[PDB]
Amino acid sequence: TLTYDDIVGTGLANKCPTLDDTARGAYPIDSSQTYRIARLCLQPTTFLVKEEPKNKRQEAEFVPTKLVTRETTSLDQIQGELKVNSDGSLTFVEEDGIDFQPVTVQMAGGERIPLLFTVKNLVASTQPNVTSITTSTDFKGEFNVPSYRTANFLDPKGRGLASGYDSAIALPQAKEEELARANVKRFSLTKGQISLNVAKVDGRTGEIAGTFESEQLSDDDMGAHEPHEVKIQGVFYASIEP
Amino acid sequence: EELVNVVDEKLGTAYGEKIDLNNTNIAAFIQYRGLYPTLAKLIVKNAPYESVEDVLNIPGLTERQKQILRENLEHFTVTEVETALVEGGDRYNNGLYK
Amino acid sequence: KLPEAYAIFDPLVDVLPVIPVLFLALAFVWQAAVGFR
Amino acid sequence: AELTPEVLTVPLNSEGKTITLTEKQYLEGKRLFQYACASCHVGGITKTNPSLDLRTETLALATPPRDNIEGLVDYMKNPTTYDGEQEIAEVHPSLRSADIFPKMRNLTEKDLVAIAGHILVEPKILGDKWGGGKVYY
Amino acid sequence: METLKITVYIVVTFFVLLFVFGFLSGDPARNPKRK
Amino acid sequence: DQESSGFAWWAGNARLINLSGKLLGAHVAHAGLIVFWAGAMTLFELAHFIPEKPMYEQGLILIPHIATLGWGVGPGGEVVDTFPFFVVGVVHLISSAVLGFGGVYHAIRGPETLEEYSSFFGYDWKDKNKMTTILGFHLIVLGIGALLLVAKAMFFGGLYDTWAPGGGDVRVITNPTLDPRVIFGYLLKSPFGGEGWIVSVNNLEDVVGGHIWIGLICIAGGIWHILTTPFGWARRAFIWSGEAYLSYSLGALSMMGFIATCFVWFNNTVYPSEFYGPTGPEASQAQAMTFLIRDQKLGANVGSAQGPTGLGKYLMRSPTGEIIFGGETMRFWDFRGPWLEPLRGPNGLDLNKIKNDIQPWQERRAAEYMTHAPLGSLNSVGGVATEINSVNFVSPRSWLATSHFVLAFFFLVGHLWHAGRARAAAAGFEKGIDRESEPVLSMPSLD
Amino acid sequence: RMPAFFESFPVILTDKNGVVKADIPFRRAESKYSFEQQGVTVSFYGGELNG
Amino acid sequence: SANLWERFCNWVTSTDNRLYVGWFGVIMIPTLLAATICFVIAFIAAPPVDIDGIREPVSGSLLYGNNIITGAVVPSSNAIGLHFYPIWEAASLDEWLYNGGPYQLIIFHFLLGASCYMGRQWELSYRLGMRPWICVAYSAPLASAFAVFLIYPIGQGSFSDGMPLGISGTFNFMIVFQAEHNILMHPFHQLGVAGVFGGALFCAMHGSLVTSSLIRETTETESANYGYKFGQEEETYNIVAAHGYFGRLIFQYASFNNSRSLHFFLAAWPVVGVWFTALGISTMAFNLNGFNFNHSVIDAKGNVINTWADIINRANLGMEVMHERNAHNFPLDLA
Ligand code: CLA
Ligand code: CLA
Ligand code: CLA
Ligand SMILES: C=Cc1c(C)c2cc3nc(c4c5[nH]c(cc6nc(cc1[nH]2)C(C)=C6CC)c(C)c5C(=O)[C@@H]4C(=O)OC)[C@@H](CCC(=O)OC/C=C(\C)CCC[C@H](C)CCC[C@H](C)CCCC(C)C)[C@@H]3C
Ligand SMILES: CC1=C(/C=C/C(C)=C/C=C/C(C)=C/C=C/C=C(C)/C=C/C=C(C)/C=C/C2=C(C)CCCC2(C)C)C(C)(C)CCC1
Ligand SMILES: CC1=C(/C=C/C(C)=C/C=C/C(C)=C/C=C/C=C(C)/C=C/C=C(C)/C=C/C2=C(C)CCCC2(C)C)C(C)(C)CCC1
Ligand SMILES: [Ca+2]
Ligand SMILES: [Fe+2]
């Protein structure tokens, strides 16, 4: 119905597919038939950042933060095969799509926490004995959190990993010892965890919807400082097909 | 307790001497007879190789493609997949041009 | 693409656009002859 | 007295023969080169695919070999990838596709010779400049 | 944030008005002696 | 005339402020230089124009206008027949002799005042009515002209249509956009990014409808004026002087001069881009198209590809969420063009389509445009300032937009110059402060 | 060496006749003379690092 | 009364108000106060602004690591482009600040007020019965502020481009512009220079000569300045002794003697010249750049002989390459 000249600017292009309160259906899983996920969407809604320990080991919590970017957060076009291995459980294997978005949120104090909201190489599974996906179903799994910046990124003073300066070019005769940290750009790579909990179904069309929560790490800045912990709470659509 | 630049370090290995099947970027193959266009995309598109010869075992290769690969194996090598060099599709567009 | 027949005018056709400039230049020859009354 | 007929001698065939193009052809080759190439191959590079250039050594490792007249000529008639695997006359100007790349329509077997002959003489004059760019401007 | 948009337009309109009228108010007239 | 009697030599033409007869010849003679040009230059173009070589690659700017009206083009702007060009060019070149004859005559032989030579043609500046009359006529004359376009579209051959369903090609509009809503909409549409202003207009239905909606307004005014006189406020508002009348018409042109510089630089519709070069944003877009394709057609997974900053080389999102092309081109995510739309979906550039619906005609069209972007030097040397010689070319889109901003600007300067002079020649002191009665000398000091 | 003029200067290493033999790259993507790749070393004489 | 509006219109138009608020001034006054006030705060405190499109925020304010010379108000983001980004279009000030909202607010307002300021520079003259045109001499600077803050961006597609409000970022705008348009090699700039360079030259001349021919009316121990009295009757120096010397310096007719004819040449030279540079920036805004003589003077064999135009280009490349290091993904800089 709605087209491009229909959505452009409304920012509806970031929010993704809903299911009118009719859901609660059940999509029959054949097991004798191969299933795949046409389009898996993940729409961020809330970002929290565990307050850096106070040093005083007294249970740090995840505080809310303000989105300093715009409506450039959603993950969409994600697809891959929804494998039906033994014991009825389903396993989704992420194949390709717009599975990552650089988000930057301004935190309570003053800071600005840029993270790489993603679900790359995601592989989520469900409860054993899954017959007809229902509101009781849900997936969980890990995924790879690449690295905010690529090997090619240069810093304000020129230094970089796969390219760029070797050192503090502007301080020719200073001690390199203490500048090491920032002159050698390391490229991290870590694991992230999610869990999509189905809230609506449409037995017919074969499309489920729901809420998701994932936890990952922030940007370490080519390893200049420690990364902050993030938790993302959003919504997700998912069109399943044989 | 030393910080190390993975890329400069990798220019000590075979990488920096021969085309690394697991790391080097696709445009590296445009330096040997009929190897680029079609094979390069294959080589690269086929995960890491536990060792040079393993190229020879890529799916649906023609007894001709296979013949060439054997010819150029002497220019290939293999090293641990290095994220900094592989991540971000850097193997199809490492950001360089003329 | 100037139809063959006319193609004996290429040289002329090539100069026509500049004429207008000339007017402004002739208007200066006029005032020079009239001593800029 | 610098662009001598020796600097104008480039491999004709792949077996070994050579052709000593005239200073008349050269110039015309250049005119034709800017007419249908430069747009994308200025300085002997490639705006829409920097990976492949027109450096003589590069054409040599091409497939089939393009480091000679016949080869370049074949190309302008029916282009293929650097491996020869695919015919690419539908996205690269050629005679096999003049209906889509008009400029090519004029071109005649004679022209094709010059344009080609030009791609082989330039690097003889310019040297490294012909290959890369910016860096060498 | 919407309230700020309203305000501003109200505010911008007030002045745009003043300007248009002020000249319509027979400005030519205001000067030493309109020959 | 003379200086010791009129003005000053370099101010000559003001010596005609009150000599309508000559002032007619001035206007006629000139209105001949424009036609002369339109004509003399179209043949200069044509005499060089090469049937099958991009127009934009040949420094043409007049022929492109004629082609857009649907004259000697055919599919994709194929330049099917040159004659319409030769035809249009000469007609003008001749009508210049006519007008030229009038000017020379009316500014020499003819009466140098229409006073008694004919009381209907004679006119009075302060005559706050014979003006409203003359205006009225002209207002009708323009109307007839506007309607001429609608004719060429709805009845005689149609016009060019880049957006042509089959693809660029002449098309007869037969569904002009009537309705104030859509038409006048463009009128109050922000001139800022995205929602353009008048420069939007992406279809000929509207271009035509909009014009139909003009005569039936422009002529409606041409009458209301030949049938009335300025109301109260109207009189106590403007300065009724010949020079002052000029001023208002000076700013008018200047204001449009920009509206034009913007039109030929941004619009794709009423400036095909098949005849003119590609839009500036259009070319910055096509470079991404070109490489999103080349790399995909080579192993890359453009949808997941992440660039140096973390935004993704080929695709990223816009502030409102749409999926656009990545790189500096993120600024031109407003570009809408024929060759690209088929890859657009409801949320923006769609992956599936991009992944396997990219016909070759686009791959090469996209390449054509990125290699013909609006960049070059004064001595016409296409490309970036650091580029080497060869490929001399400068987009018509540049030449045009460039010239008109100069003209457009200087005219605004001109506007002030006269609007400021006539507005003080009225109060009457444009020649200096009256020694004897310095207004300032009779005003309470401020300190 | 650094020409008193340049705030910063690249480190190029050449042989006897000034042939570029080694250097420190900027874009590793295609280093040909990078140290390591050339296996450069350094020895000291006199001074306190002598030997 | 007599209906306050009638009255209001009289004050607004008072010919004797310390500062002449006019009809134009009714806008100039609030517009410039919004700009000037937002600028002063932005410059002192204000988070780093993601200028280019990426996410590499630049900080320009003082409380964020700058000094007067380096600090600046950074241009709205490239992701924003030419789009209209007012405060109400932000989800929060922080968003507005991070994306460079302050810039748009500040320039749209300065350009509006600076224009009315031009209009105002006419109204008063009129109200004082003096000749107009002063406002036309001021149309040169305005035209230059318009080119640099509005025209150049409309051409390039984004306010991210277009000189940033700060001393050092102004040098940035230039050093880059060169590399992208080879401006020093464009007629309009050279005329800009002849204007600005010339202007100064004549400012020294006029000021020079006049001072050199003041009529002795003071002791040796008291300012030469006292010899003139505000509003005094006749001239205060010998415009003939002036010409008597200058004429002889070069040669009689290669000189002035008509104060009116001389003073006009003073206001026309720099204005005409400065207009042009405005027309250059406004012209190179649509990519009709400066002259290009790269690889001309080729020799007999075809060897390129390099002229100074090349050493130029060589230094231009270096600029072209390093600028906006992380903002490019493809070979050609078409934005
Ligand atoms: C729209 C059309 C227009 C019209 C009908 C008029 C009409 C008039 N003008 Mg205005 N004027 C205009 C636009 C227009 N002007 C603009 C845009 C400007 C800003 C530059 C001016 C600036 C202007 C000034 C400064 C003056 C007038 C004056 C006058 C009056 C006398 C004419 C005259 O002196 O001619 C004589 C003309 C010449 C000396 C020759 C033209 C010289 C120009 C500078 C050359 C440009 C030529 C070409 C573009 C460049 C050559 C190529 C180059 C690369 C070498 C007359 C009423 C005069 C007056 O008395 O005011 C009431 C006066 O002093 N005008
Ligand atoms: C192109 C535009 C243009 C036009 C149409 C006019 C028109 C006019 N000018 Mg202006 N003028 C212009 C530009 C223009 N001027 C410029 C740029 C300047 C600054 C140098 C002046 C300076 C100026 C002055 C100083 C004076 C005029 C005067 C006049 C008026 C009387 C003409 C005259 O005295 O001829 C004199 C006659 C001649 C010596 C003949 C000139 C040759 C003819 C006209 C050209 C024939 C054209 C073509 C080659 C043949 C076509 C023929 C074909 C159709 C068969 C006339 C309305 C006068 C005025 O105001 O009168 C009260 C006056 O004193 N003008
Ligand atoms: C060729 C163009 C043209 C011209 C020059 C005129 C000229 C004139 N008209 Mg006519 N008119 C025209 C076309 C034209 N009209 C058309 C097509 C129609 C439709 C039939 C009319 C209908 C019409 C009516 C109904 C009336 C006039 C009147 C008048 C006279 C004075 C009114 C006025 O100008 O107020 C100037 C306007 C203002 C003081 C308002 C300013 C505020 C507005 C809302 C903002 C405008 C902002 C703009 C959109 C933004 C850009 C601004 C820029 C500076 C950046 C004047 C002689 C009046 C008259 O006296 O009758 C004869 C009158 O009552 N006209
Ligand atoms: C922008 C460049 C600039 C130039 C070209 C310039 C030129 C001139 N200024 C003069 C005067 C002045 N200039 C003044 C203030 C200024 N002048 C300025 C800037 C300039 N002034 C500035 C910024 C100021 C401060 C406001 C004053 C106060 C005066 C005068 O009183 C005087 C004058 O009379 O005014 C008109 C004239 C002296 C004639 C002379 O000395 O002959 C003798 C020397 C000759 C003939 C030999 C030339 C000597 C030089 C060293 C050699 C240059 C080599 C080549 C000839 C040319 C170089 C080529 C270029 C492409 C680089 C001369 C026309
Ligand atoms: C008043 C005056 C003036 C002005 C003037 C003018 C503005 C004029 C115009 C004029 C004109 C405006 C003219 C025109 C003419 C035209 C002609 C004479 C034409 C002819 C044509 C022909 C003949 C055509 C044909 C052809 C063809 C078809 C093809 C081939 C070639 C040819 C070309 C042959 C002046 C400044 C001097 C001075 C003062 C006074
Ligand atoms: C849709 C369309 C179209 C159409 C168009 C139209 C319909 C238009 C209209 C238009 C219009 C409808 C316009 C209007 C305008 C206006 C103006 C421009 C005005 C101005 C004014 C002024 C300037 C005033 C002034 C003043 C004041 C304010 C105050 C007091 C005083 C005075 C009087 C001075 C087209 C074809 C393009 C295309 C397609 C689409
Ligand atoms: Ca010719
Ligand atoms: Fe003075």
UniProtKB/Swiss-Prot annotation, chain A:
GO terms for biological process: photosystem II assembly; photosystem II stabilization. PSII binds multiple chlorophylls, carotenoids and specific lipids. Coiled coil: none annotated. Transmembrane segments: none annotated. It is a peripheral membrane protein. Pfam families: MSP (PF01716). One of its GO terms (cellular component) is plasma membrane-derived thylakoid membrane. Keywords: Membrane, Photosynthesis, Photosystem II, Signal, Thylakoid. It is found in: Cellular thylakoid membrane. GO terms for molecular function: oxygen evolving activity. Gene3D superfamilies: photosynthetic oxygen evolving center domain, Photosystem II, cytochrome c-550 precursor. InterPro entries: OMP/PagP_b-brl (IPR011250), PsbO (IPR002628). Its main location: membrane. It comes from the Bacteria. One of the extrinsic, lumenal subunits of photosystem II (PSII), which stabilize and protect the oxygen-evolving complex. PSII is a light-driven water plastoquinone oxidoreductase, using light energy to abstract electrons from H(2)O, generating a proton gradient subsequently used for ATP formation. Required for dimerization of PSII and for binding of PsbQ to PSII. PANTHER family: OXYGEN-EVOLVING ENHANCER PROTEIN 1-2, CHLOROPLASTIC. Belongs to the PsbO family. PSII is composed of 1 copy each of membrane proteins PsbA, PsbB, PsbC, PsbD, PsbE, PsbF, PsbH, PsbI, PsbJ, PsbK, PsbL, PsbM, PsbT, PsbX, PsbY, PsbZ, Psb30/Ycf12, peripheral proteins PsbO, CyanoQ (PsbQ), PsbU, PsbV and a large number of cofactors. It forms dimeric complexes. This is Photosystem II extrinsic protein O.
Swiss-Prot record, chain C:
One of its GO terms (biological process) is photosynthesis. It is found in: Cellular thylakoid membrane. Disruption phenotype: No changes in growth under low, medium or high light regimes (3-300 umol photon/m(2)/s). PsbZ and Psb30/Ycf12 are missing from isolated PSII, although low levels of PsbZ can be detected in thylakoid membranes. Residues 31-37 are cytoplasmic. The chain crosses the membrane at residues 11-30. Keywords: Membrane, Photosynthesis, Photosystem II, Reaction center, Thylakoid, Transmembrane, Transmembrane helix. The keyword Transmembrane helix applies. Residues 1-10 are lumenal. One of its GO terms (cellular component) is plasma membrane-derived thylakoid membrane. PSII binds multiple chlorophylls, carotenoids and specific lipids. It comes from the Bacteria. Its main location: membrane. PSII is composed of 1 copy each of membrane proteins PsbA, PsbB, PsbC, PsbD, PsbE, PsbF, PsbH, PsbI, PsbJ, PsbK, PsbL, PsbM, PsbT, PsbX, PsbY, PsbZ, Psb30/Ycf12, peripheral proteins PsbO, CyanoQ(PsbQ), PsbU, PsbV and a large number of cofactors. It forms dimeric complexes. Part of a photosystem II (PSII) assembly intermediate complex PSII-I; crystallized from a strain deleted of psbJ, it forms monomeric PSII before addition of the oxygen evolving complex. PSII-I includes 3 assembly factors not found in mature PSII (Psb27, Psb28 and Psb34). Belongs to the PsbK family. This is Photosystem II reaction center protein K. It comes from Thermosynechococcus vestitus (strain NIES-2133 / IAM M-273 / BP-1). The chain holds residues 10 to 46 of 46 of the full protein.
Swiss-Prot record, chain E:
The chain crosses the membrane at residues 3-24. PSII is composed of 1 copy each of membrane proteins PsbA, PsbB, PsbC, PsbD, PsbE, PsbF, PsbH, PsbI, PsbJ, PsbK, PsbL, PsbM, PsbT, PsbX, PsbY, PsbZ, Psb30/Ycf12, peripheral proteins PsbO, CyanoQ (PsbQ), PsbU, PsbV and a large number of cofactors. It forms dimeric complexes. Part of a photosystem II (PSII) assembly intermediate complex PSII-I; crystallized from a strain deleted of psbJ, it forms monomeric PSII before addition of the oxygen evolving complex. PSII-I includes 3 assembly factors not found in mature PSII (Psb27, Psb28 and Psb34). Its main location: membrane. The gene is psbI. This is Photosystem II reaction center protein I. Disruption phenotype: Decreased yields of PSII dimers with increased PSII monomers, slightly slower photoautotrophic growth, about 20% less oxygen evolution. Formed PSII dimers are stable. GO terms for biological process: photosynthesis. Residues 25-35 are cytoplasmic. Residues 1-2 are lumenal. The modification N-formylmethionine is found at M1. It is found in: Cellular thylakoid membrane. It holds the Pfam family PsbI. Belongs to the PsbI family. Keywords: Formylation, Membrane, Photosynthesis, Photosystem II, Reaction center, Thylakoid, Transmembrane, Transmembrane helix. GO terms for cellular component: photosystem II reaction center; plasma membrane-derived thylakoid membrane.
Swiss-Prot record, chain H:
GO terms for molecular function: chlorophyll binding; electron transporter, transferring electrons within the cyclic electron transport pathway of photosynthesis activity; iron ion binding; oxidoreductase activity, acting on diphenols and related substances as donors, oxygen as acceptor; oxygen evolving activity. Tyr-152 forms a radical intermediate that is referred to as redox-active TyrZ, YZ or Y-Z. C-terminally processed by CtpA; processing is essential to allow assembly of the oxygen-evolving complex and thus photosynthetic growth. Its EC number is 1.10.3.9. PROSITE patterns: REACTION_CENTER. The chain crosses the membrane at residues 20-37, 109-124, 133-147, 188-209, 265-279. Fe cation binds at H206, H263. A quinone binds at H206, S255, F256. InterPro entries: D1/D2, Photo_II_D1/D2_sf, Photo_RC_L/M, Photo_RC_L/M_CS, PSII_D1. The keyword Lyase does not apply. Keywords: Calcium, Chlorophyll, Chromophore, Electron transport, Herbicide resistance, Iron, Magnesium, Manganese, Membrane, Metal-binding, Oxidoreductase, Photosynthesis, Photosystem II, Thylakoid, Transmembrane, Transmembrane helix, Transport. Pheophytin a binds at Y117. It is found in: Cellular thylakoid membrane. GO terms for biological process: photosynthetic electron transport in photosystem II; response to herbicide. Cyanobacteria usually contain more than 2 copies of the psbA gene. This is Photosystem II protein D1 1. It comes from Synechococcus elongatus. The lineage of its organism: Bacteria, Bacillati, Cyanobacteriota, Cyanophyceae, Synechococcales.
